[PDB]
Design an enzyme around this catalytic site. Structure first.
Site, mmCIF file in Angstrom:
data_model
loop_
_atom_site.group_PDB
_atom_site.id
_atom_site.type_symbol
_atom_site.label_atom_id
_atom_site.label_comp_id
_atom_site.label_asym_id
_atom_site.label_seq_id
_atom_site.Cartn_x
_atom_site.Cartn_y
_atom_site.Cartn_z
ATOM 1 N N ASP A 1 -13.770 -1.263 0.115
ATOM 2 C CA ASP A 1 -13.294 -0.858 -1.187
ATOM 3 C C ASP A 1 -13.071 0.677 -1.075
ATOM 4 O O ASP A 1 -13.854 1.369 -0.360
ATOM 5 C CB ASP A 1 -14.247 -1.193 -2.344
ATOM 6 C CG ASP A 1 -13.920 -0.640 -3.718
ATOM 7 O OD1 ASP A 1 -12.815 -1.049 -4.296
ATOM 8 O OD2 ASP A 1 -14.638 0.164 -4.349
ATOM 9 N N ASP B 1 -18.286 -1.680 -4.397
ATOM 10 C CA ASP B 1 -19.229 -1.153 -5.387
ATOM 11 C C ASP B 1 -18.984 -1.627 -6.824
ATOM 12 O O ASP B 1 -19.929 -1.957 -7.548
ATOM 13 C CB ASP B 1 -19.218 0.376 -5.343
ATOM 14 C CG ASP B 1 -17.886 0.960 -5.767
ATOM 15 O OD1 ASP B 1 -16.907 0.859 -4.998
ATOM 16 O OD2 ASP B 1 -17.813 1.497 -6.892
ATOM 17 N N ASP C 1 -15.448 -6.032 -6.768
ATOM 18 C CA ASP C 1 -15.931 -6.380 -5.441
ATOM 19 C C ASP C 1 -17.012 -7.450 -5.478
ATOM 20 O O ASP C 1 -17.554 -7.794 -4.424
ATOM 21 C CB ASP C 1 -16.459 -5.131 -4.729
ATOM 22 C CG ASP C 1 -15.449 -3.995 -4.712
ATOM 23 O OD1 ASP C 1 -14.255 -4.258 -4.455
ATOM 24 O OD2 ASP C 1 -15.850 -2.837 -4.958
ATOM 25 N N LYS D 1 2.294 20.670 -21.633
ATOM 26 C CA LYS D 1 0.887 20.947 -21.377
ATOM 27 C C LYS D 1 0.634 22.354 -20.853
ATOM 28 O O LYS D 1 1.349 22.860 -19.984
ATOM 29 C CB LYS D 1 0.317 19.926 -20.395
ATOM 30 C CG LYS D 1 -1.191 20.008 -20.299
ATOM 31 C CD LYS D 1 -1.765 19.021 -19.318
ATOM 32 C CE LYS D 1 -3.278 19.089 -19.357
ATOM 33 N NZ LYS D 1 -3.763 20.472 -19.097
HETATM 34 MG MG LIG Z 1 -15.353 0.780 -6.514
#
Ligand SMILES: [Mg+2]
Ligand SMILES: C[C@H]1O[C@@H](O[C@H]2[C@@H](O)C[C@H](O[C@H]3[C@@H](O)C[C@H](O[C@H]4CC[C@@]5(C)[C@H](CC[C@@H]6[C@@H]5CC[C@]5(C)[C@@H](C7=CC(=O)OC7)CC[C@]65O)C4)O[C@@H]3C)O[C@@H]2C)C[C@H](O)[C@@H]1O
Ligand SMILES: *[C@@H]1O[C@H](CO)[C@@H](O[C@@H]2O[C@H](CO)[C@@H](O)[C@H](O)[C@H]2NC(C)=O)[C@H](O)[C@H]1NC(C)=O
Ligand SMILES: *[C@@H]1O[C@H](CO)[C@@H](O[C@@H]2O[C@H](CO)[C@@H](O)[C@H](O)[C@H]2NC(C)=O)[C@H](O)[C@H]1NC(C)=O
Ligand SMILES: CC(C)CCC[C@@H](C)[C@H]1CC[C@H]2[C@@H]3CC=C4C[C@@H](O)CC[C@]4(C)[C@H]3CC[C@]12C
Ligand SMILES: CC(C)CCC[C@@H](C)[C@H]1CC[C@H]2[C@@H]3CC=C4C[C@@H](O)CC[C@]4(C)[C@H]3CC[C@]12C
Ligand SMILES: *[C@@H]1O[C@H](CO)[C@@H](O)[C@H](O)[C@H]1NC(C)=O
Ligand SMILES: [Mg+2]
Ligand code: NA
Lengths: 291, 996, 32
Positions: B349, B690, B694, B460
């Site tokens: 990931d 994480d 996942d 901006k």
């Molecule tokens: Mg992650």
């Protein structure tokens, strides 16, 4: 995935033909070398022992005391009438005493007449081969009175009041030493304490000792034991056709139809005992003459 | 019908977010500014369940205890115990005065399985216990507007269809439909994987509810701003709810180590039943009846079962797992420690796992020169040259003109992991100034802010005016920051080493190319400028009230650019390189934007510098992408938008023809599809993630690797391995240990498998040659469960004979744990020599006691009989029952000692598979003690007062201790020269036939 | 008599050796 048997690219049971031959040849040479190595070392081991004496003799320190009817459980159960009930006993008694007949001991070059009276031990030099084949003292069946007879091919033994001879375990170089004249209460026995190994039978408890009424012993010249003139043993190689001493024991007054225990204990200084081996020194039997 | 449920969960989610405000309110029956009455809320409360995912399925402790008493190895020992009691019953009811050997062995085997189950279960339970001490579930309350009043209630007390307000810092309660937002930026990192804080607008933006901005999600935290929204989904129906429920209801699979155990048992029992059956037939052919033959069959088959191998293998795995726990690399499964070594493809990931999941100042553009700041997670990289006036000016513009400050407890915390309040970008800037510029506290209060101008929605820019306390100029200091395209329109002066210069295009175009360098690198760039206001035209008492033109917007002095992005973790690059060195295909799997994922992959090692994508070739050739051939590009980027419209074959082709793959914008379900596609190749897949996305990928993978802190709780529970330290290098340590213990296991197995030949051969010849029993059962137990335990366990402590991190991952269908080579060595050659040594000691003892080896043939008929007390030996002597039996037991004891003697050399040779004993060396201290303890223990088992009374192990005459020495020496010599030829001839005969 | 083996002395020496080699092994795993 378990049909790896064959393929068109040559495989059998998992591998090819040339590979099967390579592996088989290797294993044959390898195992051949292993076998040759084991045989060579076992040959060295054979060269480390002699032909006239075992190197270690301590595992047979206390001699045994066996009997002629090698019963399945040292029990003698039969019928005084039925001849087939006690066939298994008589068969073993005749086969055992078949080598004690007067015709078997006929050659004077290997047999020596010891004597009608038990004498001192007979030492025929050392255990080496410098001397020829030693002589073996004769022991005719006549010594075991009332349990030998002059019967035919079938030793007509005792149906009522059976006979059970005892034998001392043949040991090489063993010199039996009977107990001193200072006998520590050895159950009335003859005064021939110096040239015979005593063996006395008895019951086992207050019941067996009472059921067994009278016992009659028979031996060389009438002594309940083994004469010292037949010891020591010089191995089967130097003394083939050797005849160890025998001593019969008959139980005359038995309580028929009752299993009673008898313990024949051999006494002596060089005779040990064992609480684990009921045969080392002593000897047990369970007699039951059921009518 | 659960199949249909799991299938309806594997589908991508759907929604009705694309509805007008009137349509949404009519569909839900809820006021837009007042929500609903409290009675209505309570009615929905007691209608479907509180807004909280249903707890996980509780696993009672007696269930997993019974589980550790079974499996495959324990099952084999179980059938062994059952066969022992079977043979015992047949021997009890059929013969006179039966022996209690089969019964003793049955209860012993049963006890072995039970004790091993208790030990293994205690280990897995220990890991689960320390895992339970990690649930820091803080009850968070939601801000709900009902009946026209704001109220904070428990998140579980929230229902469907009611107004919910969220403040920057509050976690989104349930899935909301944004109705009115004001500068709201939420963090969808833990769910979809989007790195930078994605803003949330009330207007519908994308057909995909994941990419749209009018939807707040479960477990997402509002970074900044405030927002309002109607609750559409609640509880398990939420996005992350369906994700978690899917992860819990997925299959775990079969670990490679367990499959290897299964194969090992197949071969063990194969040869066991072959020998038992062939010997059963042989016994019936000789003279033995059906009764005795059945007893022999069971004895031979059960004897070929390594009783002690279960515990030794278990303890081996436990030792390696212990080392894993020492490095904070926890494994919830006792055998998952090996799965890393067998891995051949890692699906990682990006955000959170590879990267630190935090916006950090990456590069700067000062003096027309790029400066790379330190972006490591613990500050251990190179620092720029912080000695020029340009850097002082730039750092002052950043530290002053920024809406970011620390909090109360931010004191004893590092400059990076500390908490900051405000925008993520401003937080990164604050940390960089607090690190490479001293501090920002006194630096900000030294320049008292007069008038500020926050960031505007359009065009901006963020500016402010401050007082200058320098002892050289009392003029006011104006500072401004913004997008580079917005600052170029409001600047004319350029700062260089201290002095100013005009906006010459010769260097301005260089500024543009540097901006394209940082932007094309997947970073977010911000330009910083300042200017000295003329104190003569604006005195020290004038107040620049923010209404009209009081600050020169143009003609400002630009200092330099400051880019930022989420950087990868510290040891992540090196670790990735290590995994590619070991031969593992590193595949990035994430739902982040491709523009950032490609750059991160190039920055971690997933994409090699030089390889081009299918799009890069066309871009370099100025031709359409449909012209180039995908075979010319070794790497490729796969967009999730295109992944949904794919088949299995297409994905297979993508994996087979592209060595560097980067899956971007992939939904959680699509992540699971990627893992399944990698598994179809027949290779071992490991997934490192994480976020909640996942969770299915970590559950279905052969091993899921979760982060101990930067990972969501769901994926952390669905994974098989946890990294409490979040150090990705642990993956490398893992793949090292897995292969290590694998090879060591091979050795430890071969050792125990070698002793089987001298353990069974005595009984085999006891059946064939009809000679007294050379080896008793009790002595065999003293070998399998006594002496050899420590040598076999010490064999697990063996190190790497060569660099294991250099070889390619083991092939599943080729490199098996136990193969024909191992059996050919143990059961075929070494165990054979051990058996011959035992028979040698046997014949030596019997011949020296008066029973010539040739005289022992056919003597068992009169030997095993208990009443023949006049068995004639070779010297004419008559041996009583207990005398010759004493010799048999005092022959079983030195036979066991003989086994120990041959096991010395067997342990030494098994210690080194390929290297020599002199190469590897006896440096394994545990093995040395294994030999010392084993030898001393055997001697004690033979000479303790009462061994011949309890274990029937009589004392030994000192010559027997040397009856096996030449056999052991020969074993050592043969295996040593074998390894020598394996070294000098690494061809095929001595390598493909013996090297196991 | 040659039928008597001093099994007690051999057993004693075997126990002494079994203790010495074991404690030495314990010292082996304790490199200090
Ligand atoms: Mg992650
Ligand atoms: C009718 C007739 O009966 C006559 O008596 C006979 C007759 O009944 C037949 C009877 O045979 C037995 C005997 O040889 C003993 C024999 O032990 C062997 C198999 C049974 C035992 C328990 C034993 C110890 C070793 C033991 C096996 C059982 C299998 C083992 C557990 C096995 C192992 C399995 C393992 O995991 O580790 C080792 C290897 C060997 C093993 O250790 C060895 O088992 C045989 C079945 O012997 C009697 C003396 C008398 C008279 O002639 C009368 O008229
Ligand atoms: C051997 O058996 C015979 C019987 O055949 C016994 O002879 C008897 O002996 C008793 C004295 O004990 C005499 O009263 C009988 O008249 C004898 N009968 C016969 C037929 O001879 C003889 O005693 C036994 N021998 C021993 C030593 O007990
Ligand atoms: C042989 O044993 C018998 C017992 O079987 C003895 O005779 C018994 O003597 C008791 C008195 O003590 C009587 O009550 C029994 O009636 C007798 N039984 C028989 C069958 O006579 C006998 O005295 C013993 N004889 C010898 C020589 O020992
Ligand atoms: C019949 C058998 C015993 C004889 C075979 C000869 C054996 C015992 C000899 C032949 C060559 C010798 C080895 C030669 C090479 C090495 C490497 C060196 O740096 C140390 C010595 C060492 C470790 C020797 C140990 C003993 C050895 C293996
Ligand atoms: C190959 C070498 C280095 C291994 C070293 C261990 C050898 C030398 C040791 C291990 C066990 C030892 C035996 C241990 C037990 C007995 C009984 C004792 O009362 C006499 C010594 C005797 C007979 C020992 C002889 C030497 C011996 C075989
Ligand atoms: C033993 O003592 C008795 C008298 O108590 C005696 O008659 C006999 O001869 C002695 N025998 C020997 C061998 O001394
Ligand atoms: Mg075993
Ligand atoms: Na799993």
């Amino acid at each position: 995935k378990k049909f790896i048997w064959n393929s068109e690219k040559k495989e059998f049971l998992g591998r090819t033909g040339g590979s099967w031959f390579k592996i088989l040849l290797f294993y044959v040479i390898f195992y051949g070398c292993l076998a040759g190595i084991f045989i060579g070392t076992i040959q060295v081991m054979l060269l480390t022992i002699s032909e006239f004496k075992p190197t270690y003799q301590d595992r047979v320190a206390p001699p045994g005391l066996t009997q002629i009817p090698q019963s399945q459980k040292t029990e003698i159960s039969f019928r005084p009438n039925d001849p087939q009930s006690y066939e298994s006993y008589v068969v073993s008694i005749v086969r055992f005493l078949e080598k004690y007949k007067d015709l078997a001991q006929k050659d004077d070059m290997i047999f020596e007449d010891c004597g009608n009276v038990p004498s001192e031990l007979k030492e025929r030099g050392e255990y080496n081969n410098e001397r020829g084949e030693r002589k073996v003292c004769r022991f005719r069946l006549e010594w075991l009175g009332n349990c030998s007879g002059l019967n035919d091919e079938t030793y007509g033994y005792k149906d009522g009041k059976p006979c059970v001879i005892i034998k001392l375990n043949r040991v090489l170089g063993f010199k039996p030493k009977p107990p001193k004249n200072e006998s520590l209460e050895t159950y009335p026995v003859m005064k021939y304490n110096p040239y015979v190994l005593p063996v006395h039978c008895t019951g086992k408890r207050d019941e067996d000792k009472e059921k067994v009424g009278t016992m009659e012993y028979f031996g060389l010249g009438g002594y309940p034991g083994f004469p010292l003139q037949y010891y020591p043993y010089y191995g089967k190689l130097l003394q083939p056709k050797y005849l160890q001493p025998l001593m019969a024991v008959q139980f005359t007054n038995l309580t028929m139809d009752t299993e009673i225990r008898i313990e024949c204990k051999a006494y002596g200084e060089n005779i040990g005992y064992s609480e684990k081996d009921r045969f080392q020194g002593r000897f047990d039997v369970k007699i039951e003459v059921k009518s | 019908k659960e199949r249909d449920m799991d299938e309806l969960k594997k589908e991508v989610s759907m929604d009705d977010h694309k509805l007008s405000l009137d349509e949404l309110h009519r569909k839900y029956g809820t006021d837009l500014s007042r929500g609903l009455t409290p009675a209505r809320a309570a009615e929905i409360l007691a209608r479907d369940g509180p807004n909280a995912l249903t707890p996980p399925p509780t696993t009672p402790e007696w269930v997993k205890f019974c589980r550790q008493l079974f499996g495959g190895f324990s099952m084999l020992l179980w059938i062994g115990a059952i066969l022992c009691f079977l043979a015992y019953g047949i021997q009890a009811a059929t013969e006179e005065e039966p022996q209690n050997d089969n019964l003793y062995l049955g209860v012993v085997l049963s006890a072995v399985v039970i004790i091993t189950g208790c030990f293994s279960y205690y280990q897995e339970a220990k890991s689960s216990k320390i895992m339970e001490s990690f649930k820091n579930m803080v009850p968070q309350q939601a801000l709900v507007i009902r009946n026209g009043e704001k109220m904070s209630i428990n998140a579980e007390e929230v229902v469907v269809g009611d107004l919910v307000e969220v403040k920057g810092g509050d976690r989104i309660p349930a899935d909301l439909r944004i109705i009115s937002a004001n500068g709201c930026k939420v963090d969808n990192s833990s769910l979809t994987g989007e790195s930078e804080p994605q803003t949330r607008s009330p207007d519908f933006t994308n057909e995909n509810p994941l990419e749209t901005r009018n939807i707040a999600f479960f477990s997402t935290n509002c970074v900044e701003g405030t927002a309002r929204g109607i609750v559409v989904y609640t509880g398990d129906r939420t996005v992350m709810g369906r994700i978690a429920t899917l992860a819990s209801g997925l299959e775990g699979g079969q670990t490679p180590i367990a499959a290897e155990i299964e194969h090992f048992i197949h071969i063990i029992t194969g040869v066991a039943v072959f020998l038992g059956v062939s010997f059963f037939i042989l016994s019936l052919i000789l003279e033995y009846t059906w009764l005795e033959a059945v007893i022999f069959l069971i004895g031979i088959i059960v004897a070929n079962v390594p009783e002690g191998l279960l515990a030794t293998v278990t303890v081996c795995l436990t030792l390696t797992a212990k080392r894993m726990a020492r490095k904070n690399c926890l494994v919830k499964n006792l055998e998952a420690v090996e799965t890393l070594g067998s891995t051949s493809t890692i699906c990682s990931d990006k955000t959170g796992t590879l990267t630190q999941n935090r916006m950090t100042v990456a590069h700067m553009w000062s003096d027309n020169q790029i400066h790379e700041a330190d972006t490591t997670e613990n500050q251990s990289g190179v620092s720029f040259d912080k000695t020029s006036a340009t850097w002082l000016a730039l750092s002052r513009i950043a530290g002053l003109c920024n809406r970011a400050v620390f909090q109360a407890n931010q004191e004893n915390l590092p400059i990076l992991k500390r908490a900051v309040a405000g925008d993520a970008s401003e937080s990164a800037l604050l940390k960089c100034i607090e690190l490479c510029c001293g501090s920002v506290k006194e630096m900000r209060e030294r320049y008292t802010k007069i008038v500020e101008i926050p960031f505007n929605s359009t065009n901006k820019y963020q500016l402010s005016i401050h007082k200058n306390p320098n002892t050289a100029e009392p003029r006011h200091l104006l500072v401004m920051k913004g997008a580079p395209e917005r600052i170029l329109d409001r600047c004319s002066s350029i700062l260089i080493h201290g002095k100013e210069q005009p906006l010459d295009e010769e260097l301005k175009d260089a500024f543009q190319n540097a901006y394209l360098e940082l932007g094309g690198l997947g970073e977010r760039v911000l330009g910083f400028c300042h200017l000295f206001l003329p104190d003569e035209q604006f005195p020290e008492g004038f107040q620049f009230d923010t209404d009209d033109v009081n600050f020169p917007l143009d003609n400002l002095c630009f200092v330099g650019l400051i880019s930022m992005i989420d950087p990868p973790r510290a040891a992540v690059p090196d670790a990735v390189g290590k995994c590619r060195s070991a031969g593992i295909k590193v595949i990035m799997v994430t739902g982040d934007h491709p523009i950032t994922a490609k750059a991160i992959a190039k920055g971690v090692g997933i994409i090699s510098e030089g390889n081009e994508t299918v799009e890069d070739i066309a871009a370099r050739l100025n031709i359409p992408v449909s012209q180039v051939n995908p075979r010319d590009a070794k790497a490729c980027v796969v967009h999730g938008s295109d992944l949904k419209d794919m088949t299995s074959e297409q994905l297979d082709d993508i994996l087979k023809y592209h060595t560097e793959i980067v899956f971007a914008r992939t939904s959680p379900q699509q992540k699971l599809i990627i893992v399944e596609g990698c598994q179809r190749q027949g290779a071992i897949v490991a997934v490192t993630g994480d976020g909640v996305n996942d969770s299915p990928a970590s559950k279905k993978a052969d091993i899921g690797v979760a982060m101990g802190i930067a990972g969501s709780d769901v994926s952390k529970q669905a994974a098989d391995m946890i990294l409490l330290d979040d150090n990705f290098a642990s993956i490398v340590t893992g793949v090292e240990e897995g292969r290590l213990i694998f090879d060591n296991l091979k050795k430890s197995i071969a050792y125990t498998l070698t002793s089987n030949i001298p353990e069974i051969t005595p009984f085999l010849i006891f059946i064939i040659a009809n000679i007294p029993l050379p080896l008793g059962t009790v002595t065999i137990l003293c070998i399998d469960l006594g002496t050899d335990m420590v040598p076999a366990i010490s064999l697990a402590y063996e190190q790497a004979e060569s660099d294991i991190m250099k070889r390619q991952p083991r092939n599943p269908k080729t490199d098996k744990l136990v193969n024909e080579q191992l059996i050919s060595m143990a059961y075929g050659q070494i165990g054979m020599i051990q058996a011959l040594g035992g028979f040698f000691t046997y014949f030596v003892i019997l011949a020296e006691n008066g029973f010539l080896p040739i005289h022992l043939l056919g003597l068992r008929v009169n030997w095993d009989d208990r009443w023949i007390n006049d068995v004639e030996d070779s010297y004419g002597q008559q041996w009583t029952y207990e005398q010759r039996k004493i010799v048999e037991f005092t022959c079983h004891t030195p036979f066991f000692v003989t086994i120990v003697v041959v096991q010395w050399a067997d342990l030494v040779i098994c210690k080194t598979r390929r290297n020599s004993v002199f190469q590897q060396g006896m440096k394994n201290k545990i093995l040395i003690f294994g030999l010392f303890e084993e030898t001393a223990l055997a001697a004690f088992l033979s000479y303790c007062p009462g061994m011949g009374v309890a274990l029937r192990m009589y004392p030994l005459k000192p010559t027997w201790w040397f009856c096996a020495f030449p056999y052991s020496l020969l074993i050592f010599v043969y295996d040593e020269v074998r390894k020598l030829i394996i070294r000098r001839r690494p061809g095929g005969w001595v390598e493909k036939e013996t090297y196991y | 008599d040659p039928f008597y083996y001093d099994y007690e002395t051999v057993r004693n020496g075997g126990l002494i050796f079994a203790a010495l080699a074991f404690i030495v092994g314990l010292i082996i795993i304790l490199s200090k």
